[PDB]
């Protein structure tokens, strides 16, 4: 082992003819032939093979001397070992040929030498990666052309669905894609998740390849199982430089997802400016119905950023629009308690006392939220403090069920009546008691008159589903 | 030998104040039109009107014509045609930002309209409303 690691054939001759064993292996499982194959000593390898060290050998890792010669980049060792009798078709503990083990680094002459003899380049690795898959991660250009000389198909893909085009776009080697274009890789290459060649460019921001993808005249309209387009994946992780050029390149203006999701509201959700400007120019409608019925205006108002309340005016939409629940922009504003947005909205001219489909008002909802600010602002908006629900529930009953004594006191101070019995016979005092809220019950019971009836259904506002 | 011709206008919905594209008639050897119901009348011969013919000739004598352009989608043809209208000085360059929006809206058919509620003719302004 030390003779093959330090390259001395003179003492190797003596150690062989006096006495030795070529089969003796180290902790790695390495033969001395393996060490000579690693450190590129030739005379030691010749002496060991003239002794009769076996060509076939298994290291404890799982490699072969052909695999070591391919991974180390030694040409004369490969020449001697393949002349003297060897098999390129050999499998490791992960099924890998020396073609896979060579194209892991891209040594050119060993690849030509292995290809010259009988080796099947169309092959599957442990995860069934073709040598094109391992060659794509290199970024090596003519190494691809040598595999295409033996016409390895780009139709072939791994178990995960990834193709040599997919890995070439993953690592983003542009001249590799230029080489791949003449090989005519299909643009219907779809993984199980439904991804397109445009999708990884949208994710990773490798964007010089967009003109390459349009060299084969790519079509932006492409939907997988989730119906997603390069624009939705582009806006999910924003690299705006591609989208600004895709929009003149026949972009899809109002394509919905399987959730009915337009790019508008996902753009708004993570606040940003330029995307809205581009979609607006290219025709983005904030009134599109989802499967719930929520609009991009409403989902934008739920987050209620500062610049959105500015831009949304340029877009023309129903200022307050109900949902299936009846949720109006005001409802969402009260839900998130954004005073700024609520202000902008009131300035726009929304309805102050908007009611839900069940009969909940923005006061009820604010009381359930418990936001005192969302009750002062509303008081300024002139929303009635005694608005009753379709089931008799008033802002008092609601503040009691929520337990927000602060809001209940703010309501009462502003003239809210505390003696309103609901459709279940419970006043704010009855509730405060039944809920064991003492701080609230102290004010509510005294403000409230004697309970209208002797007697437990609570009250929660509707909300849009995921 | 026999072709299909479609016509779309820029109208507004009874649901909410907006602008959008709605088709109005279809042509396969005959004219077929629909009313407010969303139902198509029985096909018939098409009858033209005097001012229609006069103004088609008048505008066609001074119309820009682009033949065999290499494009793939409406957005590109729209960009190229508005560049052409700039080129022959048919419209002012300060108009393009509105015009581009004017020709980029959702082109939807009759089946949504009953949910939409119906349409009526409306006019574009300089503002965009």
Swiss-Prot record, chain A:
Keywords: ANK repeat, Cytoplasm, Cytoskeleton, Disease variant, Elliptocytosis, Hereditary hemolytic anemia, Hydroxylation, Lipoprotein, Membrane, Phosphoprotein, Repeat, Sarcoplasmic reticulum. Regulated by phosphorylation. The keyword Phosphoprotein applies. GO terms for biological process: cytoskeleton organization; endoplasmic reticulum to Golgi vesicle-mediated transport; exocytosis; maintenance of epithelial cell apical/basal polarity; positive regulation of organelle organization; protein localization to plasma membrane; signal transduction. ANK repeats lie at residues 1-24, 28-57, 61-90, 94-123, 127-156, 160-189, 193-222, 226-255, 259-288, 292-321, 325-354, 358-387, 391-420, 424-453. The modification Phosphoserine is found at residues 87, 417, 439. Component of the ankyrin-1 complex in the erythrocyte, composed of ANK1, RHCE, RHAG, SLC4A1, EPB42, GYPA, GYPB and AQP1. Interacts with a number of integral membrane proteins and cytoskeletal proteins. Interacts (via N-terminus) with SPTB/spectrin (beta chain). Also interacts with TTN/titin. Isoform Mu17 interacts with OBSCN isoform 3/obscurin. Interacts with HIF1AN. Interacts (via ANK 1-5 repeats) with RHCE; this interaction mediates the primary membrane attachment site for ANK1. Interacts (via ANK 1-2 repeats) with AQP1 (via the N-terminal). Interacts (via ANK 1-13 repeats) with EPB42. The 55 kDa regulatory domain is involved in regulating binding of SPTB/spectrin (beta chain) and SLC4A1/erythrocyte membrane protein band 3. This is Ankyrin-1. It comes from Homo sapiens (Human). The chain holds residues 343 to 812 of 1881 of the full protein.
Curated annotation (Swiss-Prot), chain B:
Changing residue 93 to S: In SPH4; Mondego. It is found in: Cell membrane; Basolateral cell membrane. Residues 122-129 are annotated as: Interaction with ANK1. Detected in erythrocytes (at protein level). It comes from the Eukaryota. N-glycosylated. Functions both as a transporter that mediates electroneutral anion exchange across the cell membrane and as a structural protein. Component of the ankyrin-1 complex of the erythrocyte membrane; required for normal flexibility and stability of the erythrocyte membrane and for normal erythrocyte shape via the interactions of its cytoplasmic domain with cytoskeletal proteins, glycolytic enzymes, and hemoglobin. Functions as a transporter that mediates the 1:1 exchange of inorganic anions across the erythrocyte membrane. (Microbial infection) Acts as a receptor for P.falciparum (isolate 3D7) MSP9 and thus, facilitates merozoite invasion of erythrocytes. Acts as a receptor for P.falciparum (isolate 3D7) MSP1 and thus, facilitates merozoite invasion of erythrocytes. It is linked to Ovalocytosis, Southeast Asian: An autosomal dominant hematologic disorder characterized by ovalocytic erythrocytes that are rigid and exhibit reduced expression of many erythrocyte antigens. Clinical manifestations include mild hemolysis, intermittent jaundice and gallstones. However, the disorder is most often asymptomatic. A dimer in solution, but in its membrane environment, it exists primarily as a mixture of dimers and tetramers and spans the membrane asymmetrically. Component of the ankyrin-1 complex in the erythrocyte, composed of ANK1, RHCE, RHAG, SLC4A1, EPB42, GYPA, GYPB and AQP1. Interacts with STOM; this interaction positively regulates SLC4A1 activity. Interacts with GYPA; a GYPA monomer is bound at each end of the SLC4A1 dimer forming a heterotetramer. Three SLC4A1 dimers (Band 3-I, Band 3-II and Band 3-III) participates in the ankyrin-1 complex. Belongs to the anion exchanger (TC 2.A.31) family. This is Band 3 anion transport protein. It comes from Homo sapiens. The lineage of its organism: Eukaryota, Metazoa, Chordata, Craniata, Vertebrata. The chain holds residues 55 to 183 of 911 of the full protein.
């Amino acid at each position: 082992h030390v003779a093959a690691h330090c390259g001395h054939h003179r003492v190797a001759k003596v150690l062989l003819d006096k006495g030795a064993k070529p089969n003796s292996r180290a902790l790695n499982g390495f033969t001395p032939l393996h060490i000579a194959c690693k450190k590129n000593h030739v005379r030691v390898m010749e002496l060991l093979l003239k002794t009769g060290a076996s060509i076939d050998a298994v290291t404890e890792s799982g490699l072969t001397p052909l695999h070591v010669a391919s991974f180390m980049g030694h040409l004369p060792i490969v020449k001697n070992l393949l002349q003297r009798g060897a098999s390129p078709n050999v499998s490791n503990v992960k099924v890998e040929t020396p073609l896979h083990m060579a194209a892991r680094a891209g040594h050119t002459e060993v690849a030509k030498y292995l290809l010259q003899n009988k080796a099947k380049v169309n092959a599957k690795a442990k995860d069934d990666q073709t040598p094109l898959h391992c060659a794509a991660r290199i970024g090596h250009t003519n190494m691809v052309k040598l595999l295409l000389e033996n016409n390895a198909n780009p139709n072939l893909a791994t178990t995960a669905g990834h193709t040599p085009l997919h890995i070439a776009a993953r690592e983003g080697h542009v001249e590799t894609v230029l080489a791949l274009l003449e090989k005519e890789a299909s643009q219907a290459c779809m993984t199980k998740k439904g991804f397109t060649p445009l999708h990884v460019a949208a994710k990773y921001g490798k964007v010089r390849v967009a003109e390459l993808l349009l060299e084969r005249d790519a079509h932006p309209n492409a939907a997988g199982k989730n119906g997603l387009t390069p624009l939705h994946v582009a806006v999910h992780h924003n690299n705006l430089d591609i989208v600004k050029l895709l929009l003149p390149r026949g972009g899809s203006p109002h394509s919905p997802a399987w959730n009915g999701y337009t790019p508008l509201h996902i753009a708004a959700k993570q606040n940003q400016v330029e995307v809205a400007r581009s979609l607006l120019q290219y025709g983005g409608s904030a009134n599109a119905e989802s499967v719930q019925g929520v609009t991009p205006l409403h989902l934008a108002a739920q987050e209620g950023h500062a610049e959105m309340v500015a831009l949304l005016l340029s877009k023309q939409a129903n200022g307050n629009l109900g949902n299936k629940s009846g949720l109006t922009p005001l409802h969402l504003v009260a839900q998130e308690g954004h005073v700024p947005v609520a202000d902008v909205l009131i300035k726009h001219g929304v309805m102050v006392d908007a009611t839900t489909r069940m009969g909940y008002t923005p006061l009820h909802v604010a009381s359930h939220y418990g936001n005192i600010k969302l009750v002062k602002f509303l008081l300024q908006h002139q929303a009635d403090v005694n608005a009753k629900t379709k089931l008799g529930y008033s802002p008092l009953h609601q503040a009691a069920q929520q337990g927000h004594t602060d809001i209940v006191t703010l309501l009462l101070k502003n003239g809210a009546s505390p003696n309103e019995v609901s459709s279940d016979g419970t006043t704010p005092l009855a509730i405060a008691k039944r809920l064991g809220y003492i701080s609230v019950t102290d004010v509510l019971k005294v403000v409230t008159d004697e309970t209208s009836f002797v007697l437990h259904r609570m009250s929660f506002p509707e909300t849009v589903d995921e | 030998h026999k072709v299909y011709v479609e016509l779309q206008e820029l109208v507004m919905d009874e649901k909410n104040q907006e602008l959008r594209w709605m088709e109005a008639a279809r042509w396969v050897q005959l004219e077929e039109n629909l009313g407010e119901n969303g139902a198509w009348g029985r096909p018939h011969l098409s009858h033209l009107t005097f001012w229609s013919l006069l103004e088609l000739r008048r505008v066609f004598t001074k119309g820009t014509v682009l033949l065999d352009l290499q494009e793939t989608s409406l957005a590109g043809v729209a960009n190229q045609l508005l560049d052409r209208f700039i080129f022959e000085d048919q419209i002012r360059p300060q108009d393009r930002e509105e015009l581009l929006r004017a020709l980029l809206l959702k082109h939807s058919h009759a089946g949504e309209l009953e949910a939409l509620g119906g349409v009526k003719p409306a006019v574009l302004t300089r503002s965009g409303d």
